[PDB]
Design an enzyme around this catalytic site. Structure first.
Site, PDB file in Angstrom:
ATOM      1  N   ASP A 138      30.302  65.192  51.547  1.00 31.70           N
ATOM      2  CA  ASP A 138      31.132  65.732  50.520  1.00 31.70           C
ATOM      3  C   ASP A 138      31.329  64.919  49.254  1.00 31.70           C
ATOM      4  O   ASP A 138      32.165  64.050  49.178  1.00 31.70           O
ATOM      5  CB  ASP A 138      32.600  65.895  51.178  1.00 31.70           C
ATOM      6  CG  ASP A 138      33.511  66.661  50.297  1.00 31.70           C
ATOM      7  OD1 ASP A 138      33.129  67.361  49.311  1.00 31.70           O
ATOM      8  OD2 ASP A 138      34.752  66.603  50.428  1.00 31.70           O
ATOM      9  N   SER A 159      28.435  70.539  31.392  1.00 31.65           N
ATOM     10  CA  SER A 159      27.203  71.320  31.138  1.00 31.65           C
ATOM     11  C   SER A 159      27.142  71.787  29.721  1.00 31.65           C
ATOM     12  O   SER A 159      28.181  72.072  29.059  1.00 31.65           O
ATOM     13  CB  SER A 159      27.215  72.560  32.112  1.00 31.65           C
ATOM     14  OG  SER A 159      26.013  73.316  31.864  1.00 31.65           O
TER      15      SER A 159
HETATM   16  C1  LIG Z   1      41.934  63.982  47.883  1.00 33.81           C
HETATM   17  C2  LIG Z   1      41.634  65.469  47.924  1.00 33.81           C
HETATM   18  C3  LIG Z   1      40.197  65.763  47.340  1.00 33.81           C
HETATM   19  C4  LIG Z   1      40.348  66.099  45.866  1.00 33.81           C
HETATM   20  C5  LIG Z   1      39.720  67.005  48.105  1.00 33.81           C
HETATM   21  N1  LIG Z   1      38.476  67.549  47.513  1.00 33.81           N
HETATM   22  C6  LIG Z   1      38.206  68.854  47.795  1.00 33.81           C
HETATM   23  O1  LIG Z   1      39.052  69.578  48.287  1.00 33.81           O
HETATM   24  C7  LIG Z   1      36.826  69.434  47.514  1.00 33.81           C
HETATM   25  C8  LIG Z   1      35.974  69.166  48.784  1.00 33.81           C
HETATM   26  O2  LIG Z   1      34.624  69.337  48.438  1.00 33.81           O
HETATM   27  C9  LIG Z   1      36.290  70.252  49.879  1.00 33.81           C
HETATM   28  C10 LIG Z   1      35.492  69.944  51.148  1.00 33.81           C
HETATM   29  C11 LIG Z   1      35.459  70.927  52.286  1.00 33.81           C
HETATM   30  C12 LIG Z   1      34.487  70.624  53.389  1.00 33.81           C
HETATM   31  C13 LIG Z   1      36.891  71.125  53.024  1.00 33.81           C
HETATM   32  N2  LIG Z   1      35.846  71.586  49.322  1.00 33.81           N
HETATM   33  C14 LIG Z   1      36.714  72.627  49.382  1.00 33.81           C
HETATM   34  O3  LIG Z   1      37.880  72.483  49.649  1.00 33.81           O
HETATM   35  C15 LIG Z   1      36.145  73.997  49.133  1.00 33.81           C
HETATM   36  C16 LIG Z   1      36.901  74.883  48.197  1.00 33.81           C
HETATM   37  C17 LIG Z   1      36.001  75.220  47.037  1.00 33.81           C
HETATM   38  C18 LIG Z   1      36.936  75.847  45.979  1.00 33.81           C
HETATM   39  C19 LIG Z   1      37.576  76.990  46.789  1.00 33.81           C
HETATM   40  N3  LIG Z   1      38.981  77.069  46.462  1.00 33.81           N
HETATM   41  C20 LIG Z   1      39.451  78.417  46.374  1.00 33.81           C
HETATM   42  S1  LIG Z   1      41.040  78.756  45.999  1.00 33.81           S
HETATM   43  N4  LIG Z   1      38.562  79.498  46.598  1.00 33.81           N
HETATM   44  C21 LIG Z   1      39.195  80.820  46.462  1.00 33.81           C
HETATM   45  N5  LIG Z   1      35.657  74.596  50.345  1.00 33.81           N
HETATM   46  C22 LIG Z   1      34.545  75.242  50.500  1.00 33.81           C
HETATM   47  O4  LIG Z   1      33.824  75.538  49.569  1.00 33.81           O
HETATM   48  C23 LIG Z   1      34.210  75.748  51.890  1.00 33.81           C
HETATM   49  C24 LIG Z   1      33.300  74.671  52.545  1.00 33.81           C
HETATM   50  C25 LIG Z   1      33.121  74.850  54.039  1.00 33.81           C
HETATM   51  C26 LIG Z   1      32.327  75.786  54.605  1.00 33.81           C
HETATM   52  C27 LIG Z   1      32.132  75.988  55.999  1.00 33.81           C
HETATM   53  C28 LIG Z   1      32.824  75.132  56.834  1.00 33.81           C
HETATM   54  C29 LIG Z   1      33.654  74.149  56.275  1.00 33.81           C
HETATM   55  C30 LIG Z   1      33.822  73.986  54.896  1.00 33.81           C
HETATM   56  N6  LIG Z   1      33.523  77.011  51.871  1.00 33.81           N
HETATM   57  S2  LIG Z   1      34.471  78.401  51.750  1.00 33.81           S
HETATM   58  O5  LIG Z   1      35.363  78.388  52.986  1.00 33.81           O
HETATM   59  O6  LIG Z   1      35.270  78.519  50.641  1.00 33.81           O
HETATM   60  N7  LIG Z   1      33.458  79.767  52.023  1.00 33.81           N
HETATM   61  C31 LIG Z   1      33.394  79.979  53.504  1.00 33.81           C
HETATM   62  C32 LIG Z   1      34.167  80.993  51.466  1.00 33.81           C
END
Ligand SMILES: CC[C@H](C)CNC(=O)C[C@H](O)[C@H](CC(C)C)NC(=O)[C@H](CCCCNC(=S)NC)NC(=O)[C@H](Cc1ccccc1)NS(=O)(=O)N(C)C
EC number: 3.4.23.22
Length: 330
Positions: free
Chosen positions: A35, A199
Site C-alpha cells: 500500500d 497530472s
Molecule cells: C494514516 C491513514 C492513511 C492516510 C490511510 N490511507 C488510506 O486509507 C489509503 C490506503 O490506500 C487504503 C488501503 C486499503 C487496503 C484499506 N485505501 C483505501 O482505504 C481505499 C479507499 C479508496 C477511496 C475510497 N473511499 C470512498 S469514500 N469510496 C466511496 N480502499 C480501496 O480502494 C479498497 C481496497 C481493497 C480491496 C479489496 C480488499 C481490501 C481492500 N477497494 S474498495 O473496497 O473500495 N472496492 C471493493 C469498492
C-alpha cells in the site's frame, strides 16, 4: 542489495494485489497488501481476537527468535474505506524477494475491523507512503523502504501491476526489459505524507488532451481511479448506456459496451489506460450492468491514481532526498 517479488490479484476483478513477505526466523510467510497510500506494516497474529480471525495466516511473535517487543508502543489506524485495526508492536527481520531488513517494526494486530476478517486472502498491509503517516505511538516507526534505503543498490522501488495477471514489485533496481519508451519523472509533494503529484491533463478516447492540473496521489492500495467529478462526467458522456447509479455508488454501463481509453498526462508524456481496464466487472455475477473503473473523487476530498491507472504503466517510486515518481508505458 536488491529484491524482486511477484504480486497477484486477490480475485478475478483485481480489487487488490498481495505479495508474499517473510517475517521472523525461521521465516513465517504472510501475503500482504503492498500500500503506497499508508505507512504501517501490520499483520494478523497470535494476538488478534480469535473471532476476528477468518482463514488469514497469522504471525506468531513467539515462534520467531529475532522478534523483540517494542516496550510501550501501540498503534491505531483507520483507512479511507472505513476499515481499521490496532494493536502493539514488535521489531523482527522482514524479507521481500530476497531483500532483508533487520529490526523492521511489525505491528501486531489485537483487533481487526469486519472487512479485514472477511478478506481471507490478505494477511496484513506493508505500507510504502512517507514514514510521517506511520501510526505507531509515541515514536513513529519507519517503513520497510526507509529501512532498506541504506542497503539498496539505488533508493527506489517500482510497481508493475498486472491486468488480470501477476505483476512485480522490485526494490533497488529498474528493470529496463519491463517497459517501452523511457520513464518520465514528475515532482512529488510530501506535505500530506503521500506519493502526491500533479497530472498535466487528460484525454477521453481519440479526442483532445485538455491541460488541467490534477493533483492526486499514486496508491497501489486503492482499487479504482478517482478523478474530479467534471473530468469523470466527460469520460462517461462517451458511453451511451452509461449512467450514475445512487444505488450502486457510481457510474454503471452495459457490460456489452466497448469503452473508450483514458489518457492522463505526466509532464509531457501521456499514459493511455485501455478501455477494457476501465470495465471493472459486473455489479453481480450474470448481470448485464457493469461497474465503471473511473469514479468521482468529490466525496473522498483528494484524487486517487489507484489500480486501474497504475496497472496501465511501469511506475517508479524514487525515494531519494528529493523524491520523484516516474511513469513508463508498458
Ligand atoms: C494514516 C491513514 C492513511 C492516510 C490511510 N490511507 C488510506 O486509507 C489509503 C490506503 O490506500 C487504503 C488501503 C486499503 C487496503 C484499506 N485505501 C483505501 O482505504 C481505499 C479507499 C479508496 C477511496 C475510497 N473511499 C470512498 S469514500 N469510496 C466511496 N480502499 C480501496 O480502494 C479498497 C481496497 C481493497 C480491496 C479489496 C480488499 C481490501 C481492500 N477497494 S474498495 O473496497 O473500495 N472496492 C471493493 C469498492
Amino acid at each position: 542489495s536488491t529484491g524482486s517479488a511477484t504480486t497477484t490479484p486477490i480475485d478475478s476483478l483485481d480489487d487488490a494485489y498481495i505479495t508474499p513477505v517473510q517475517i521472523g526466523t525461521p521465516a513465517q510467510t504472510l501475503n500482504l497488501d503492498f500500500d503506497t497510500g499508508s505507512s504501517d506494516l501490520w499483520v494478523f497474529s497470535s494476538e488478534t481476537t480469535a473471532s476476528e480471525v477468518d482463514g488469514q495466516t497469522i504471525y506468531t511473535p513467539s515462534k520467531s527468535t529475532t522478534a523483540k517487543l517494542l516496550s510501550g508502543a501501540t498503534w491505531s489506524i483507520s483507512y479511507g474505506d472505513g476499515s481499521s485495526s490496532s494493536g502493539d508492536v514488535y521489531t523482527d527481520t522482514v524479507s521481500v524477494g530476497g531483500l532483508t531488513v533487520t529490526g523492521q517494526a511489525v505491528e501486531s494486530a489485537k483487533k481487526v475491523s469486519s472487512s479485514f476478517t472477511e478478506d481471507s486472502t490478505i494477511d496484513g498491509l506493508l505500507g510504502l507512503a512517507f514514514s510521517t503517516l506511520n501510526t505507531v505511538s509515541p515514536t513513529q516507526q519507519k517503513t520497510f523502504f526507509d529501512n532498506a534505503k541504506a542497503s539498496l543498490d539505488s533508493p527506489v522501488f517500482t510497481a508493475d501491476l498486472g491486468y488480470h495477471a501477476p505483476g512485480t514489485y522490485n526494490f533497488g533496481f529498474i528493470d529496463t526489459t519491463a517497459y517501452t519508451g523511457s520513464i518520465t519523472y514528475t515532482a512529488v509533494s510530501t506535505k500530506q505524507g503521500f506519493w502526491e503529484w500533479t497530472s498535466t491533463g487528460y484525454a477521453v478516447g481519440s479526442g483532445t488532451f485538455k491541460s488541467t492540473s490534477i493533483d492526486g496521489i499514486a496508491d497501489t492500495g486503492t482499487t479504482l481511479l478517482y478523478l474530479p467529478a467534471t473530468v469523470v462526467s466527460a469520460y462517461w458522456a462517451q458511453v451511451s448506456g452509461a449512467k450514475s447509479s445512487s444505488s450502486v455508488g457510481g457510474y454503471v454501463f452495459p457490460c456489452s459496451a466497448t469503452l473508450p481509453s483514458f489518457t492522463f498526462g505526466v509532464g509531457s508524456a501521456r499514459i493511455v489506460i485501455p478501455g477494457d481496464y476501465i470495465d471493472f466487472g459486473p455489479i453481480s455475477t450474470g448481470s448485464s450492468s457493469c461497474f465503471g473503473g473511473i469514479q468521482s473523487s468529490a466525496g473522498i476530498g483528494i484524487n486517487i491514481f489507484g489500480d486501474v491507472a497504475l496497472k496501465a504503466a511501469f511506475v517508479v517510486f524514487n525515494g531519494a532526498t528529493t523524491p520523484t515518481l516516474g511513469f513508463a508505458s508498458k
